[PDB]
Design a protein around this nucleic acid. Structure first.
Ligand code: FES
Ligand SMILES: [K+]
Ligand SMILES: [Mg+2]
Ligand SMILES: [Mg+2]
Ligand SMILES: [Mg+2]
Ligand SMILES: [Mg+2]
Ligand SMILES: [Mg+2]
Ligand SMILES: [Mg+2]
Ligand SMILES: [Mg+2]
Ligand SMILES: [Mg+2]
Ligand SMILES: [Mg+2]
Ligand SMILES: [Mg+2]
Ligand SMILES: [Mg+2]
Ligand SMILES: [Mg+2]
Ligand SMILES: [Mg+2]
Ligand SMILES: [Mg+2]
Ligand SMILES: [Mg+2]
Ligand SMILES: [Mg+2]
Ligand SMILES: [Mg+2]
Ligand SMILES: [Mg+2]
Ligand SMILES: [Mg+2]
Ligand SMILES: [Mg+2]
Ligand SMILES: [Mg+2]
Ligand SMILES: [Mg+2]
Lengths: 97, 122, 137, 99, 49, 86, 72
RNA sequence: GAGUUAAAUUAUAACUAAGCUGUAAAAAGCCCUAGUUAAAAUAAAAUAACCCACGAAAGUGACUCUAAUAAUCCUGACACACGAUAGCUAGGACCCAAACUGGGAUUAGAUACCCCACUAUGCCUAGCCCUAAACCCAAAUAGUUACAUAACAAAACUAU
């Protein structure tokens, strides 16, 4: 008879889960600019999750997309393409101190 | 589209470039392929020097061809382009639009795992 | 004073000339700093050698030539021979990792030679020849 | 006699909802040279540093404004059966209470 | 629905009749797929240059 | 060998100093892990050792990054005790 | 052993009406010429069960599963 | 299965230099060498990977395409199929690493650790051999958190 007892309902304050940078977006091996932002400009290495910040699905796709462009002849391997050196920075690594 | 042809051609003038595409598209049709469209990516400096047919190439034009073809004729198309000398590096991949972008919900946070050791006094 | 670490790309036109010549016209100083020897060679923009110097040629012998001081002396001697042919600025390329990397870099500076750009070209195989086995010292 | 269930429904704590980003006023009950122990009505007491402006009027019993972030700081570390509490609360100073 | 869109898409397919026209048209209309991404997830199109 | 020269792993000096520029180059290589990679490629390690090395590097990285969080989490509990001699 | 005809519409694009009125280009795109081995198995399985099984709509029956294994 | 090659290395050519490799320190070896520039074949697959996926296991992480991962979803051998690495038989490849062997050094001796050279072989095609700390030392299928700490470790237990 007591209406003050709590009801068995889900949490109404569940904030939506965080979206990665490339969530709901289609990666490709033809757009060099998108792939080049995740490559160290001085060396040409590929950043990991702790630097890129992407989720578990788009990190593998970027890795496969980049390597496809390495062999098919669309982007340099040992360095970042200088034409896309002024693109906005998305990684969290800083070299200059 | 079903197949995509990552075609890179040696840099040359307008007439022979059109001729090279004309016979390349003819070769695809002879193997039983219905080409959808031709996309031009312009001429760009190659990322690195590529050796093909006893030549060192630094500049070339990029072209993209998408078509529907039987699975058994992919080897014939690749072999034919290998003997052609006006193409520097041909490659065939499945068209990316064939696969659908899988729906995503978010980055699910993984809680730290417990109960990995006994509760005895260390 | 906006200064960019990245080198001036040859495709573009950067108004940054040293001694009246462009970036690519400046000669090159190749430095091979091995674990037992350091070899220094300066070549022109057309890859024509100008002067050569190494720890062995400067009187150091055996284990002595692998020390930093031996590489430091080689840089002074190499710069002195290079400056005789009339070169002021040079782009230094470092090959390999060794004890003589720092000494050779500052050896050229104190030898009357000025450097403007540093490049590391250590041979890094990507999977390549199988190296030698371990040493159970 | 009022049932305990009704008390929780109308209690200010329940009406607050999530503790993150909530403007809650509190009263200072202890003063150190640079630390202000503030009770905002929660289970524990938050600690804040005296601001450089109007710092001389922050005395015992003074009311201030706070922005609660976590009601009770508590985390889990590997190898710990039970979480290690801090016995404090996290909050920031927005100024003094405007009487 | 799937066969209906292929019915319309069949009109623009390249045949031997219009082999020359499509080649000539392609060589005069370059296009690129390049586009950058920002921290917040907004798409930046380099075509604005 | 096929790529353009004087683009990758290259820095330029400023104001005429070379010691500062060289240290900047070393930080770039150390961050990208090339310095340790060259050290491990002087000799060859069997694949048995490679997995044993990555099972110790990963364990250290978990323990170090977990102890570090507790240090920062408990860092605020270092003020002078207000109840001394209570 | 069975040999499905090449110029046949695949399993999905058969019961939809208005196919024979379409030009040869679209019919070519839907035939087995532009279909991989996976689509070929569907045609073989569909035809095989319609010749030996009594009730094709029943899948949990033992006879239906034996036909499916025989195709593989 | 089929096709393909980025980074390194080597045959080889040009130029300069007289020395080059090597160690805690040396000797031997090389001087047909070393540095730079240009460059096949063979072999091996940086960063991604702080990810933990696929396969029955042993295993697999350079790229592309084709074929493709049993069972309407229990247990089961001495039967059928498979099984890293080393080893054998025949043909082909050989950058580089390298048991054996020779030389140098160390030592009372060193047919060992250290240094230099090179072979089997590691590789491709066809066949055989069927062994591992083949170990996550924890058998398969369903479950329970009740009862209850030999020790140690990766908590305890029930049913077929
Ligand atoms: S979180 Fe949705 S794809 Fe990354
Ligand atoms: K590789
Ligand atoms: Mg090469
Ligand atoms: Mg040979
Ligand atoms: Mg001698
Ligand atoms: Mg030589
Ligand atoms: Mg693994
Ligand atoms: Mg199984
Ligand atoms: Mg299965
Ligand atoms: Mg059984
Ligand atoms: Mg075997
Ligand atoms: Mg074997
Ligand atoms: Mg063998
Ligand atoms: Mg025998
Ligand atoms: Mg043999
Ligand atoms: Mg041999
Ligand atoms: Mg050898
Ligand atoms: Mg001997
Ligand atoms: Mg094993
Ligand atoms: Mg056993
Ligand atoms: Mg077992
Ligand atoms: Mg069993
Ligand atoms: Mg089973
Ligand atoms: Mg079980």
């Amino acid at each position: 008879s007591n209406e003050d007892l709590p009801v068995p309902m889900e949490n109404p304050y569940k904030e939506p889960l965080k979206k990665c940078i490339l969530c709901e977006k289609h990666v490709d091996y033809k757009n060099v600019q998108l792939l080049s932002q995740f490559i160290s400009p001085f060396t040409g290495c590929i950043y990991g999750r702790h630097i890129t910040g992407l989720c578990g699905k788009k990190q593998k796709e970027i890795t496969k997309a980049i390597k496809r462009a390495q062999i098919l002849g669309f982007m340099p391997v040992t360095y970042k393409d200088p034409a896309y050196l002024k693109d906005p920075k998305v990684c969290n690594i800083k070299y200059r101190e | 589209p079903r197949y995509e042809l990552a075609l890179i051609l040696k840099a040359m003038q307008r007439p022979e470039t059109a001729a090279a595409l004309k016979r390349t598209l003819e070769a695809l049709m002879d193997r039983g392929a219905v080409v959808r469209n031709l996309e031009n990516l312009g001429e760009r400096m190659l990322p690195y020097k590529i050796s093909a047919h006893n030549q060192r190439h630094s500049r070339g034009g990029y072209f993209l061809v998408d078509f529907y073809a039987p699975a058994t004729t992919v080897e014939s198309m690749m072999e034919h382009l290998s003997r052609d000398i006006d193409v520097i590096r041909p490659n065939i991949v499945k068209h990316p639009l064939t696969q659908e972008v899988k729906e995503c919900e978010g980055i699910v946070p993984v809680p730290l795992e417990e109960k990995l050791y006994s509760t005895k006094k260390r | 004073s906006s200064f960019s670490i990245y080198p001036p790309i040859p495709g573009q036109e950067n108004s940054l000339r040293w001694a009246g010549k462009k970036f690519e016209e400046i000669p090159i100083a190749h430095i091979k700093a091995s674990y037992n020897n350091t070899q220094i060679q300066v070549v022109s923009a057309a890859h024509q050698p100008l002067a050569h110097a190494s720890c062995g040629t400067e009187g150091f012998r055996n284990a002595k030539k692998g020390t930093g001081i031996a590489a430091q002396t080689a840089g002074i001697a190499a710069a002195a021979k290079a400056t005789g042919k009339g070169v002021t600025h040079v782009r230094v390329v470092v090959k390999g990792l060794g004890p003589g990397r720092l000494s050779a870099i500052k050896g050229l500076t104190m030898g009357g030679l000025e450097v403007i750009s540093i490049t590391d070209n250590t041979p890094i195989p990507h999977x390549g020849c199988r190296p030698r086995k371990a040493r159970r010292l | 006699v009022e049932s305990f269930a009704s008390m929780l429904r109308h209690s200010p704590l329940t009406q607050m909802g999530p503790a993150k980003n909530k403007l809650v006023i509190g009263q200072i009950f202890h003063i150190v040279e640079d630390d202000l122990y503030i009770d905002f009505g929660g289970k524990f007491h938050c600690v804040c540093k005296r601001p450089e402006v109007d710092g001389e009027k922050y005395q015992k019993g003074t009311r201030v404004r706070l922005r609660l972030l976590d009601l009770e700081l508590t985390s889990r570390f590997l190898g710990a059966t039970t979480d290690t509490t801090i016995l404090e609360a996290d909050a920031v100073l927005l100024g003094l209470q405007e009487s | 629905q799937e066969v209906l869109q292929l019915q319309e898409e069949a009109k623009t397919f390249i045949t031997r009749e219009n082999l020359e026209a499509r080649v000539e048209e392609a060589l005069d209309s370059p296009k690129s797929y390049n586009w950058a991404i920002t921290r917040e997830g907004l798409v930046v199109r380099p075509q604005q240059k | 060998a096929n790529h353009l020269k004087f683009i990758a792993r290259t820095v330029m000096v400023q104001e005429g100093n070379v010691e500062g520029a060289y240290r900047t180059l070393n930080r770039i290589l150390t961050m990208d892990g090339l310095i340790e990679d060259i050290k491990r490629r002087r000799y060859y390690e069997k694949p048995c050792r490679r997995r044993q090395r990555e099972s110790y590097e990963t364990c250290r990285r978990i323990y170090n990054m977990e102890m570090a969080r507790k240090i920062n989490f408990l860092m605020r509990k270092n003020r002078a005790d207000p109840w001394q001699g209570c | 052993q069975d040999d499905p005809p090449p110029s046949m519409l695949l399993l999905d694009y058969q019961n939809v009406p208005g196919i024979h009125k379409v030009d040869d280009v679209v019919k070519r795109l839907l035939s087995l010429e532009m279909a991989n081995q996976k689509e070929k198995l569907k045609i073989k399985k569909m035809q095989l069960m319609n010749k030996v099984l009594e009730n094709p709509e029943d899948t949990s029956s033992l006879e239906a599963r034996i036909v499916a294994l025989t195709v593989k």
